Amino acid sequence: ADLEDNMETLNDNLKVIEKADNAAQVKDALTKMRAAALDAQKATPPKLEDKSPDSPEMHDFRHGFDILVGQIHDALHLANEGKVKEAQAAAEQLKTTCNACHQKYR
Amino acid sequence: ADLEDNMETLNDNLKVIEKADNAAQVKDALTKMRAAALDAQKATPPKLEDKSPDSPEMHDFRHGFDILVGQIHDALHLANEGKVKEAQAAAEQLKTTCNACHQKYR
Amino acid sequence: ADLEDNMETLNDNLKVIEKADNAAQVKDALTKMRAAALDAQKATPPKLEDKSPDSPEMHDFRHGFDILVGQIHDALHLANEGKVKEAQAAAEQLKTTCNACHQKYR
Amino acid sequence: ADLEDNMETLNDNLKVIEKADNAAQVKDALTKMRAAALDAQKATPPKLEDKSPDSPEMHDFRHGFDILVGQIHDALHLANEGKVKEAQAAAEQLKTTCNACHQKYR
Numbered sequence A, B, C, D: 001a002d003l004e005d006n007m008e009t010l011n012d013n014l015k016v017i018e019k020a021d022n023a024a025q026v027k028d029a030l031t032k033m034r035a036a037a038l039d040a041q042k043a044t045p046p047k048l049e050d051k052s053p054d055s056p057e058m059h060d061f062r063h064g065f066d067i068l069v070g071q072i073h074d075a076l077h078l079a080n081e082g083k084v085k086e087a088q089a090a091a092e093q094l095k096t097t098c099n100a101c102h103q104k105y106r
Ligand code: HEM
Pocket: A003, A004, A007, A008, A010, A011, A014, A045, A046, A061, A062, A063, A064, A065, A068, A094, A095, A097, A098, A099, A101, A102, A105, A106
């Protein structure tokens, strides 16, 4: 799985979550998103390939995934409580984080 | 200040950003919006007055401002970089967060 | 309050959490800690008093409080599950965030 | 890599850090520790092999690595700044987290 595969996984599972009916479905999808986000975190994206590995952009890029992983964690806790709609609402709000990184680095 | 006063401050400064010509103007407005958003986050809106404090609705309400504050943060970084048009675009994109909360709780 | 009082409030409420008998007590202390952290966030620390307000040091100083606030939120959620023992553990573990900011800026 | 291989990497790099006479070398070693800790967080340890992942011990276990990675991150930043003494100090303080987990789950 490269960065592009990780992004497919994140995108697909956000949709799985908003379509889901029960807490197990949401938990399973969030867990897949967590793995994909942790995987993507070490990647050098195409738009930063020509920058220093030690650049502020690469630092910030990696931190974008820390934010995303943190928020997935909080959503996963809601799903573990069986709070389907609250967990779905939290997953929906990950989109701001997806967008924030895309605006800078995609 | 109270919730509605915070909301007027958010709306007024969005208009200020829209009309701004330089990065200082935008930075000042975003700074004011951050403070308004943080104040608003502690409020109990009229439609949730008779809901419990850790209720799904109050939890969701508070988290809406977390999302808004994060978006202000990113817009403020652009204004800090002297990127007026980019910061204005980011400020514009805030509106979906305003809209989403209004749809539920206003 | 000033920065020093905010710091005493953080310390004192950690003690309150360690000693707590129930979830309400934990929630109340965590809530106080959030307020203290957000107040401290607005302060200029002695070690950075002569630096610019948008300096990378001031930027990082302010963000240290965001990390702390996020961890307080997570702890509050455990208390709200009635998981007092786990919430107490999470609160004790906040100390690494305290210590990290201290190494740089205290 | 498995739990034990990652743990040896962690221990090896701590010794490297303490041996080192320069910040740049410390930075190199901390980077490898960060990768190793993150690769270890996936694991179920022998002593908790009977538990589910959601259990209080396994939740506490997983968060142990979040604490460690956050500390490695802060150490890395001090090394980035060419602060050899501060980074080495931060590194040796990692052991408290190493030991706190061992005391409970090794
Ligand atoms: C759940 C949140 C996210 C979703 C749903 C998501 C979704 C996607 C999708 C579908 C793509 C490929 C389609 C396209 O290029 O337009 C993509 C690309 C990309 N994303 Fe994300 N993303 C998320 C979070 C993030 C985050 C947090 C970062 C940075 C920290 C990021 C960085 C990138 C980059 C650099 C690309 C371009 C990859 C390439 O061109 O190979 N994404 N994202």
